[PDB]
Amino acid sequence: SSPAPRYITDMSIEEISREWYMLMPRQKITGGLMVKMDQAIMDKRITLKANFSVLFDQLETLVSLRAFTDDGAIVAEISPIPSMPGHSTEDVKNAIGILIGGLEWNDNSIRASENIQRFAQKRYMAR
Amino acid sequence: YITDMSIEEISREWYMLMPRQKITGGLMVKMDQAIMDKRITLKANFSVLFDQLETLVSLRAFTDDGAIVAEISPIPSMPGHSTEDVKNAIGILIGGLEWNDNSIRASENIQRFA
Amino acid sequence: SSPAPRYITDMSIEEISREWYMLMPRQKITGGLMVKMDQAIMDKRITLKANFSVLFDQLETLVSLRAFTDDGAIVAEISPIPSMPGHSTEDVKNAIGILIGGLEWNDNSIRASENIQRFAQKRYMAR
Amino acid sequence: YITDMSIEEISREWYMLMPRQKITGGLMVKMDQAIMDKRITLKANFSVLFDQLETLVSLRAFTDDGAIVAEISPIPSMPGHSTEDVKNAIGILIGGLEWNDNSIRASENIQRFA
């Protein structure tokens, strides 16, 4: 196999480029990565999808991991902080851990894409 | 009759994480106390008698991405209300929302008729 | 009567000087006045007390108005913003209005001292 | 046996405006999701077996003014737990609280034995 960076995608160029929004914006920095999530989302199934480069079967550089509800809306993202030095593997694992932990606080159920697996009361209806 | 909102928008079910309500005259004001630091846009559907809001059917408060975070509407089983109730309810909602550092803008129709 | 400033008090020097705290801090500025309140307080009776100067039966300058729960804890305050020009009567009336409105959002019941009258689900028990 | 908390502190009833819970092993983690931007101090009462936390009775999270905003404690009807459950519950609580921009400090006893 080649030891050089190879680009892996879960997301199309629309999905990774999409402007998305948080009803209740929260964020956490870990190393060179920024984690953002919408604290309003609850009781949903959430799918993690990522675009990233690998070296030999292992994620090296994350471009973006985004969290999707079944309707295809984006509710969270892990992305590099531009002013920081490139992130470590520890940063990625930590970032995914806190994203999952954050989302499960609200009884969301998380699943990760195959690429990720391989290479890396609460509300009241008005009336 | 003025319609800032589509049928889908006024009919949409919506939820509050921290539900709070105030009643004024025949109007109920519901707002999600959990919402903070958002630009909020007020849109309303209501009748106009000559040149002033007469009967309010619904005023809903929207984030830039279209999430509903509050509503003023008649109490279903006791809907009778006045233009005064409406003015009061709006002041109440705007004050509630601004306490959580949200910024409010009203539709052109609301500014004009209310 | 004298037309010159006269000092009226609802609060002792301990009460007006007390450092106090907000579990959920909120604030609103109106003119030359700052209004702070603890958004966590609910379903309580709240008493407004103020120290201020009057000219002839009318409040002129507010030093501090503080909101007290029956146990004597402070849960809100209206006070002058030091960097601003002295506030107007309109500011005081507006500040009291938003304090009361803010507190009643949480089903608190407000009463005001005699001096003020004269001169001026929601939570779940763990388990 | 270590006691960061007094009898009053551990026995105090407390409430959440936005209640959230996670269970890990025999431990329940409850936290008020509405609390933000606070310095939070963790205090715990627990047994020590030689030189490590053995059994957790209660860990509670306090604001500077002594308000309780979260708790780790055994599920009353199924309290059996391990030192591992405790380490997990603490990571969970700290993460939950930090998501809302709270800053965490742990008692000297917690740092030492946990």
Curated annotation (Swiss-Prot), chains B, D:
It is found in: Host nucleus; Host cytoplasm. Upon interferon induction, ISGylated via host HERC5; this results in the impairment of NS1 interaction with RNA targets due to its inability to form homodimers and to interact with host EIF2AK2/PKR. Coiled coil: none annotated. Residues 92-114 are annotated as: CPSF4-binding. A motif (Nuclear export signal) lies at residues 49-58. Inhibits post-transcriptional processing of cellular pre-mRNA, by binding and inhibiting two cellular proteins that are required for the 3'-end processing of cellular pre-mRNAs: the 30 kDa cleavage and polyadenylation specificity factor/CPSF4 and the poly(A)-binding protein 2/PABPN1. In turn, unprocessed 3' end pre-mRNAs accumulate in the host nucleus and are no longer exported to the cytoplasm. Cellular protein synthesis is thereby shut off very early after virus infection. The dsRNA-binding region is required for suppression of RNA silencing. Homodimer. Interacts with host TRIM25 (via coiled coil); this interaction specifically inhibits TRIM25 multimerization and TRIM25-mediated RIGI CARD ubiquitination. Interacts with human EIF2AK2/PKR, CPSF4, IVNS1ABP and PABPN1. Belongs to the influenza A viruses NS1 family. This is Non-structural protein 1. The gene is NS.
